[PDB]
Design a protein around this nucleic acid. Sequence first.
DNA 1: GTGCCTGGAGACTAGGGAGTAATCCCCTTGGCGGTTAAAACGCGGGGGACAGCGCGTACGTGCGTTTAAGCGGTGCTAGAGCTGTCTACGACCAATTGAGCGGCCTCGGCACCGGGATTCTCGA
Length: 53
Amino acid sequence: QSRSAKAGLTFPVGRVHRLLRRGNYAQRIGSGAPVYLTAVLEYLAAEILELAG
DNA sequence: GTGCCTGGAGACTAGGGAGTAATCCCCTTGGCGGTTAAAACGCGGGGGACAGCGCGTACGTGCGTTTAAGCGGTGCTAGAGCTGTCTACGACCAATTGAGCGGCCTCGGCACCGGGATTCTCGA
């Protein structure tokens, strides 16, 4: 399974990893940080979508 | 529904951060006395918060009128991408030097301390 769906989530991981890789935010990057961004933004999106419903 | 272009996924090899030994070690947290300037209790008050009245006016509301102004068309016009093509163009590791920090020593106005001249009391 790809990294965008290995954790069973909704938001893509490769998209935010490509955004930080060329956005020049650090020298290196840990493996847990893009999926952590994935989890935080998908939880914020799900909460505001439940409130929108 | 249907679909082709392309970022996404991923293992192997150099190559630079992580937290666990290690040890100073400086800052801090905790308490004892004192003494003192600030915090607290109270008491009369008077000056400022607050209710009410006079009023008048100017906006709440309504009506004739203009007044741009909105919806729809379409050419005129001139500003936004994208692929070639070439030039600059800022970084990589290394010898040499440098210039601002670690810790040291010198001035200098401010506050405290003593004499010269002046004024006050008594004595001669």
